């Protein structure tokens, strides 16, 4: 049977998934303008948000 939707924590991180998407939004663009080096810190940040974004994608569909 259905369980109570814990809305309080969800919106608390739903702000967070907006923020780091905007954090990488500028800092890539700052890396393009400084390009006339390290390709580590971009790729990890790109995959980490969407994996958490993947989890709630299933989580609301089963509702």
């Amino acid at each position: 049977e259905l369980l109570p939707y814990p809305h309080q924590l969800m919106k608390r991180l739903l702000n967070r998934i907006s923020m780091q998407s905007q954090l990488i939004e500028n800092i890539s663009m700052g890396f393009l303008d400084m390009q006339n080096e390290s390709k580590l810190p971009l790729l990890c940040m790109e995959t980490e948000l969407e994996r958490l974004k993947f989890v709630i994608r299933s989580y609301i569909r089963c509702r």
Binding site: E46, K53, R57
Partner: protein
């Protein structure tokens, strides 16, 4: 539910596409309702596909049976006929379900 020219639910079972044409208004009332569920989310989360979890970040993909220029967003990939790619992960999800790229 809308990934590439949604309202073309044509070229699809014409002998029963008049059958479910009485059900199309039922069908499109899912489709209209599924649009506002895509927009009524306060942030942009995909609800169109991508159900299998991702594993890696670099995937070799080949193409066939397709032509033209598509993918105006996220950088144009310039799809020529029968020519493979080697790209990142999140881009091809809207094209594999579209059915243009073929093999992972």
């Amino acid at each position: 539910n809308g990934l590439d020219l949604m309202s073309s639910i044509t070229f699809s079972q014409q002998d029963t596409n008049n059958l479910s044409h009485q059900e199309q208004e039922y069908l499109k009332e899912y489709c209209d309702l599924i649009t506002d569920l895509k927009s009524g989310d306060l942030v942009d989360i995909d609800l169109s596909g991508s159900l299998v979890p991702p594993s890696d970040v670099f995937i070799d993909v080949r193409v066939l049976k397709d032509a033209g220029e598509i993918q105006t967003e996220y950088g144009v990939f310039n799809l020529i006929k029968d020519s493979q790619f080697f790209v990142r992960q999140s881009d091809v999800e809207r094209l594999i379900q579209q059915g243009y790229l073929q093999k992972i």
